[PDB]
Amino acid sequence: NNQQ
Amino acid sequence: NNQQ
Amino acid sequence: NNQQ
């Protein structure tokens, strides 16, 4: 999970 | 930049 | 920058 990568969120930006 | 999202990297996995 | 998100790196995993």
User: What is the rounded end-to-end Cα distance, in angstroms, of chain A?
Assistant: 10
Residues of chain C contacting A, Cβ within 8 Å: 2-4
Q: Does residue C3 contact residue A1 with C-beta atoms inside 8 Å?
A: no
Q: How many residues in chain B?
A: 4
Residue with tokens 């930049």: B1
Chain A adjacent subunits, 3+ CB pairs under 8 A = B, C
- For residue A3, list chain C residues with Cβ-Cβ distance below 8 A: 2
Residue B2: strand pairing partners: C2
Distance (Å) of CA C4 to CA A1, A3, B3: 8, 11, 6
Amino acid at B3: Q
> Quick one: resolution in A?
1.4
CA distance C2 to B4: 8
A1: which strand partners?
none
User: Taking an 8 Å Cβ-Cβ cutoff, which residues of chain A contact chain C?
Assistant: 2-4
